[PDB]
Each structure stands twice: as C-alpha cells, then as structure tokens.
A paper describes a structure:
[name], CHD3, and CHD5 form CHD subfamily II, which differs in domain architecture from subfamily I. CHD3, [name], and CHD5 contain two N-terminal plant homeodomain (PHD) zinc finger domains, a DNA-interacting double chromodomain, and the ATPase motor. [name] is implicated in the repression of lineage-specific genes during differentiation and is required for the establishment and maintenance of more compacted chromatin structures.
Refinement of this class of particles yielded a reconstruction at an overall resolution of 4.0 Å (FSC 0.143 criterion). The resulting nucleosome-CHD42 complex structure shows pseudo-twofold symmetry with [name] molecules bound at SHL +2 and SHL −2. The second [name] molecule uses its double chromodomain and PHD finger 2 to contact nucleosomal DNA at SHL +1 and +0.5, respectively.
Author numbering:
A (entry chain A): 38 to 134
B (entry chain D): 28 to 122
C (entry chain C): 16 to 118
D (entry chain B), H (entry chain F): 16 to 102
E (entry chain G): 14 to 118
F (entry chain H): 29 to 121
G (entry chain E): 39 to 135
The structure:
DNA sequence: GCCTATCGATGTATATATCTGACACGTGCCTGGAGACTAGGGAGTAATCCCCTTGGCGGTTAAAACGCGGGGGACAGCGCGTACGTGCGTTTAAGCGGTGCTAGAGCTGTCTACGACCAATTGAGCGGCCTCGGCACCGGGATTCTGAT
DNA sequence: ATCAGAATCCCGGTGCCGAGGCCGCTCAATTGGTCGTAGACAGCTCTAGCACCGCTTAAACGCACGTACGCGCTGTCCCCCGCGTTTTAACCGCCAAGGGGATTACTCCCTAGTCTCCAGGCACGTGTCAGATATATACATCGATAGGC
C-alpha cells in the first residue's frame, strides 16, 4: 500500500493553492447563506449576480488574511496546529471584536 | 483680536439638564468641543458621499438618517432615529 | 431662533452655516441641520450621563478628563464608535489578566 | 430513505474541506478540529457587518436590488476597499 | 493643438479631470493649474503598476495582463505595498509564502 | 447608456510603456477602479487642506502637499518631479 | 523587609492604572521630538502644546502596544514579554510588514 | 571628573525605568532585558511617521511653527485621532 | 546503527496540437471639452502689531543609575497518547443548462415647490473681568494586606 | 491560622485659582421677498432576476490506522526583580529678547460665468489569435527496505 508521511500532502496542497487564483468556497452554498443574513434586516431582497460574487471575494480575503495572522500565533507557541484560542487572539490584536 | 467659535455654552447647557449639581473642567470642555466636531465631520462627511452616489445634489433630512444608521452601532442608531425624527416633527408643526 | 422652535439646545443656524460654508453639498435642505443638531444633542447627552455617574462613583462634582475615559471604555456601544480615538490625560481601564495574579 | 430531509443550517454550506482549502492558501500546514465550529462564527459575524451596510445604501436609494456598488460602497465604509467590480 | 493633454505632454485627460474636480464638491474654485498636476500624478502611478505587471507577466509567459499578475506585482514592490495596504484585489491569489518551520529537514 | 471610464487612457499608457502587451477586461476594470481610487484619496485630501488653511480654492500647490502626504518615500519623490514637469510645460504653452 | 518577587510589580500596576498623567520625562522627550525634525526640514519651532500633544499620542501608542504584547506573551505559556513578542504584535496590526 | 561629557544619543532619554513604567500601565508584570533596546526602535520609527506629516502641513502653510493642529491633523491622517487639544 | 540507495510510485513539467473565447480595431455619432469673452473677489503683498518661543542660569530634589543577591521562570529534554492526517469507497449536491414569468431598474417628461440669494435688523454669543469654593493637599490615625512562624 | 510590618485608606484642616457669573458689544442669525432649478412623480420598455426541473460529475462524507504532533512532566540555569545608595538631570523659576504669528488695508489678476462650437470618445460590430485544455512525454522527487558501514 502507498501512503505518504502525514505532513507531506499538505505541503503539496499549499503549493497548489498559492498558484491557483479561483474561489475555494463554491458559488451555490455561499449564495444561499447571504440571503438568510439579510432577512433579519429586510424582507424581499433581490441580489445582482455580481453582488454575490463581490461579497465573496471580500469574504475570502478576510479569511485568508485571518488565516495568515492566526498561523504566526501558532508558530509563536512553538506549534503547527492552529487551535481556536489562536483566532480569538488574532482578532484581538487587529482590534476586531 | 481673534474671536474663535466653540461649543462651550451648548454642552454646559445640556449637562445641567441631566445633572444639575455637576461642574466640568475646562480640560474636559476641550474634549467635548473636539468630540462634537469629530462626530459632525464624520456624519456630514458621510452625508456628502450618500447624495453623490445617487447623483443628487441636496442633503435633505433623509441622508442624515441613512448616515446615522451607518456610523453609529446597533443600539445607539435606534435611539438617534427616534430622537431625530421627533425633532423635525416638532419643527415642522411649529412656526 | 430655530434651536427653540424644534425644542433643542444646539444652534441650528451655526450647524446650517457649517453645511454650506463647509462644502459638504451644493444644496443643503432645511430639514437636514435641524435633524443634525438633535443627533449631536442626544450623543452629547449620552456621554455626560455616563460621565457624571463616574463623578459620583468617585465623589466629585466636576468632570475631569479621567471620567470621560471611564464612561466610553466601560460602555459597549460607545466603545465601538470611538474604538480608535485616544483621549488625552485618560489612562486606561484597571484590568489584570488571570495568570498575572499571585497564587 | 426519504421521509423528511435534513435541510441543514446554511452555515454548514461553508463546508469542512472548503474551510480547509482556505487555510492551505493562508499558509497553514496542520489545522485543528475545533476550528470548523469557530470560523463559521467569524464569517457569520463578518457578513452581518457588511450586509447591514449593504441594505442601508439600498434602502436609501428606494430600490429592492443590492447591486455591485451597494457592496463596494459598503466595504469602503469599513476600510476594506475592493477593486475590479467597476467604479 | 486644442487638447490640453498634448499641451501638458500627457496621455490622461485634463478637461475630464477638471470637470471631475468641480462637480465633486471638493472646493469652490478649482484652480486651472491643479488638473495639469493631478493628471501627471495619476499617470506615474499607472506607469508604475503597468510596468511592474508586465515584468511578472513575462515570467509566466503570457501576452495579456491578468489580475494574478497585478496582485503579484503590487504585493512584491514594498513602495506599492504601503499604498495599497488594505485594498482587496479580485482574482488575486496570494504571494507564494511558506515559513521555514513547516518545511521538512 | 453612456458610462465614463478610463479604458482608453490606461491603454495608451500601456502601449507607451510595454508596447507589445495586451490586457484583459478584468484587469482593465481593476485599473479603472484604481485610477478613480487615487482620485478621492488625493482630492479628498487636497480639499481638506484648503479648508484648514482658511482658503477657498485648490491650486497646483495643494496637490503637491497632498501627494507627499499619501505616497511613500521613493514614490512621492518622483511624482512631484513628474508633476512639476507637467505644469511648467503647460504654463510655457 | 524583603518583599517577594511579584507583589511589588502588582502594586505598581494597581497604582499606575489608577493614575492618569505622563510617564515619560518631558525634557528628554522634547529633545527627541526636535531631533527628528532635522531629517525633514531644518530650523523649525515648536509650541509648548505641540510637544504635549505629541507625548499623549506617543504614550497612548506604547501602552496600547504593551497591552497587545502582554496578551501574546501570556498565550505562549510565559509571563515575560520579549522583543520577539513585539515584532509579532506589530506584524498582525499591519504596521510592520 | 570633567574633560568631556557623555552627551548620550537622545533616544536613551526615554529611560529604562520610564519604559518599565509604561509596561506596568499596560498590565505587564515581568519584563525582559532585551526589550529596552527594542522599544526605542519602535518609538523612533513611530515619531518619524507623525513628524513627517507634521512638517508637510506646516511647510504648506508657510510657517515655521508646528502648532497643536499640525499634529492633530497629522494624527487623523494616520487614523489615530486625538481629542482634548482643541478643534 | 547509519548513511546511502534505488526502487517504481505518484506527482508535476514540458511537449505540440487543436480550438473558443474575448481582445482589440473600425465605424458613426453625439456629448462635452475648447475658444472666447467679460466681471468680481479671493489671494497676494505690505505693513504694523505684540505674543511667545528660544535662550541659558540657578537651585533643588527626587528620579535615574549602579550593584548584588537570590529565586522564580525560561528553558530543554523526556514520555505519554490522542487527535490528528491519510486513503478508500460511497453518497450527495454543486454545476450546468434550461425552461417559466415579471418585478423592477432605468428611462424620459412634466412641473411645482424649495432653497439659494439678497437686504434689513437686533440679540444671541463672544471676550474680558471678576469672585468664590471644589479639590489638591498633608498628617495623622486607621486599616489591610504581606511575609514569616 | 496565627504573628508582626510596611504600605494604602481615610478624615480633616487648609487655600488656592479655576470655574461661574456678569456685563458689554458685534458679527451673524432671522425675517422677508424673489426665483429658477432640482427633484418628485408618473408613465413607459425590457433586461435580468427568481423559481422550479433535468443531469452529469465532481467534491464531500465517513470510516479506520496510526503516527507525529500536542502535552505535561522534571530538572536546571540564570536573568530577571528588589533593595540600598550615590548621582544627575529634570522641574521649576527667571531673565531677555525678537522672530514670527496674525492683524490690517489694498490691488489685481484669475477664475467662474454664459456662449458657441466641434471632434474626442463613446457604443457596437467584427474578425482572429491567445490562452484553454489535453494528452503525451519525460523527469523528477518520495518513501522503503536494502545494503554495507
């Protein structure tokens, strides 16, 4: 049986996604999630096709720049695993609450 | 000489309505003078972009109401609409 | 005077002059600065209501710049509005984290 | 199998390998397991702060359609300015 | 000539910028020297970015400029990274970046 | 209908610098957003400077003291040089 | 007598957070403010309020750095902040890239 | 003792117990020793970014005196708005 | 007990080959930039004004500096053990296209009410003056912790 | 839980100077009439949005194995804290200007303003090659047990 060492598929995975430039989250579950958040504020809201897309790019790059800034805290604890105390640190330093 | 304008008497009038037995240092009086001009530049600075996005050229009472609900957080915006709309409604009925 | 015809304290005309001379629009409607002075008046009446409570919390009658720092930072909805503003002669809130106290 | 479907909560639409693909772009080799309950809470509290601004621009313009620049002019309020989507 | 962009020796417009200063409610009296100055500073910034994009666009061997090239240029140059500090570019990817702790030895 | 853009003016600069390089529409719509985004950064700053100094006008000098505020060290020192080359050739014309 | 290590510093933190005045010495600060003016334009003058306002935006930036730094050096299972902690806490805020 | 004085570098004017008093306000119990060489480098790189804006406001207004609002209008450029110093 | 080794095993890189899509390019055309002119006031300039910033000295007084001793912490190494990654087969809904209507955006066209504009008038709101009491202030006695037993 | 010890905490007496009124006074708010533009409103095409199905095909789902992390442990070194005591520069106070901020009044050029005009710059069609996609093809790296040190 062939099986890589655990911790080597992720290294080839990182060097694939930093070369690609497409959207990782799919367009349909993100479309249905946006509609349920607006329903608490206003009923009967249509959406343009670009406003689902243009919400998505500013939702992904907020996560990747968060996942860039919760990675360094895990290296700061001499770790690799980004345990969820790192994110609630990494939003505190950027002032987001 | 130089005659500067301020918000000196207007804050001290308001403080006496909600606290009669209360003074205020001039060092704190420079804060609320600079606090109001920070807020009023932030609201009217947002009201300029609202009328410009819809290609209009008039700040009416509506754009402030859609600038107050933008800047202010969740709880404070529900008060300043209610305080704001009551002020115009007493102003429109009066002469 | 429009400050009393709407039943306010802040000057309507001084704000209304600051919306025309300030070049915030070409035209300024008459409904705008009467609405604007009340928004400033409630927000000023919100700050001193929590500032003056800090005066009786330390048994003083005048407001120094410490008590404004105590009101805005303890409040949760006023702190989101002024999250980046620093206040001169204010200090910080008294907080000690849990691992720093002696066992 | 069918008597009633699951109809899950629409926040689990941002699926577990989808979040994992985001951390691989963000330069993370090894991810925890409790983070998948956390980062849905981050994105739900983030899209709340944008769509609240996106409605109030559209509610002022007397429309029913949150267009492209009712998001871009809402993002510029938050300081995270977007490009590419015109204007 | 007649056009002001030739008379300033530029390519960006001037009369369009001069209208887009006046109707933008910036000040009462826009001076006529400022759209000559403003169209130049807009040119040099576009001449900075489009030159840096096609450098990296040649390295992936493509004739056209794609938004991946524009993300790759303005995040590489430190003097452009300080200007576009909090701007999200659509279709950007990231800079290739793995830290030295996660690598095997 | 009619939509004012910058797509021709980014293109002529592109043929001035990289004379064999095309540009996609998605890349062109970034610069058309980017050119407009430097505008309200500069003109929004030059408007704030003239109101602060009790003036009521925007000359070519207020742009020069707004460019040095925004752009960094190596970028602003060349923009003021290329700006002053543009105004002097206009006032000579 | 000889106090233990720890209850002296925890009397300082209870004392300085109650107080509200300047903790950096005035004349060494205004010799610092004047000496970085020479790198941009020589022969400048300063009002006595302008190096007072420049202290209160210098004091309230280090305090709001050390409060962010102490939450980092807590997180790495330590009690002592370090120069490696500051360069992390400046990296996440976007000041130092 | 006098033949020539030390005339130290004016960045050591922000003295070692002064920095220590700042960390005690910031809720730090125990401080390192190598931090005193570090935090002078932070304050020197911070006052450079404010005074560069403070000069350019004054250089435009044809003055020689960096007043109070050539600092407050320089700090508002950086987003760290100051209060209390008038206007 | 270790470096090398050498495998096929999966994985990318590179190769040409073929082709679809947007990319430029040409056209007609219309809105908006340019030429031209003249009136007004903002900005330039000079001049005079008096604050207020820079200078250093004297003295003083508490912070800063220097050193030491010790102990608490950073530090690394160890052994645990679970919660991760990995891979497989299995199941599922995203993708895609494709119908279906119609709200709703965007458009022109009216039309009138609103706010700019200007002049006339006076008092709210400024600076300056003035006085009194809130808080700094210390000293003592009273307390609450602290370390040591 | 006890003991004595330094270090806040308060109570009170003092007093000083900043806030609190007071008054006069002027720029500016208000009242008023005039007015033409923006904007509200109504009517109108029609493009793009939403809803379902139909269908292929991929990613998501789940499960087991295990292994490399996370994790807590001990021990050890030292780099810190804390006190004690000289030392020095900061704070305060003052002398001593004089540059420059900020005041005035004046002059004029430059901008806004309307007017007339005329192509630069638009939308839209239109070929066409530049990348999309691929399969092949070679060449890498990757563990793995193999060999010999």
């Amino acid at each position: 049986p062939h099986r890589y060492r655990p911790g080597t598929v992720a290294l080839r995975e990182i060097r694939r996604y930093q070369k690609s430039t497409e959207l990782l989250i799919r367009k349909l579950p993100f479309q249905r999630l946006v509609r349920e958040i607006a329903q608490d504020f206003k009923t009967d809201l249509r959406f343009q096709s670009s406003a689902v897309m243009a919400l998505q790019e500013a939702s992904e790059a907020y996560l990747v720049a968060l996942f860039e800034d919760t990675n360094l805290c895990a290296i700061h604890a001499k770790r690799v695993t980004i345990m969820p105390k790192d994110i609630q640190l990494a939003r505190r330093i950027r002032g987001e609450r | 000489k130089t005659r500067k304008e301020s918000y000196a008497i207007y804050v001290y009038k308001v403080l006496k309505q909600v606290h009669p037995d209360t003074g205020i240092s001039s060092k704190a009086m420079s804060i609320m003078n600079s606090f109001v001009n920070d807020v009023f530049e932030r609201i009217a600075g947002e009201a300029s972009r609202l009328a410009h996005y819809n290609k209009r050229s008039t700040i009416t009472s509506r754009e402030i109401q859609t600038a107050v609900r933008l800047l202010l957080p969740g709880e404070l915006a529900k008060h300043a609409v209610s305080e704001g709309t009551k002020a115009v409604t007493k102003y429109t009925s009066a002469k | 005077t429009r400050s009393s015809r709407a039943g306010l304290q802040f000057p309507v005309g001084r704000v209304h002059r600051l919306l025309r001379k300030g070049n915030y629009a070409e035209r300024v409607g008459a409904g705008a600065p009467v609405y604007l002075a009340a928004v400033l008046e409630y927000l000023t009446a919100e700050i001193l209501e929590l500032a003056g409570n800090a005066a009786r919390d330390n048994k003083k009658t005048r407001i120094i710049p410490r008590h404004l720092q105590l009101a805005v930072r303890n409040d949760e909805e006023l702190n989101k509005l002024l999250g980046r503003v620093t206040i001169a002669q204010g200090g910080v809130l008294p907080n000690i984290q849990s691992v720093l106290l002696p066992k | 199998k069918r008597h009633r479907k699951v109809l899950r909560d629409n926040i689990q639409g941002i699926t577990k390998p989808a979040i994992r693909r985001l951390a691989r772009r963000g330069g993370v080799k090894r991810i925890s397991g409790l983070i998948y309950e956390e980062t849905r809470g981050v994105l739900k509290v983030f899209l709340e702060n944008v769509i609240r601004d996106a409605v109030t621009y559209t509610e002022h313009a007397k429309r029913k359609t949150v267009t492209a620049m009712d998001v871009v002019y809402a993002l510029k309020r938050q300081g995270r300015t977007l490009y590419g989507f015109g204007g």
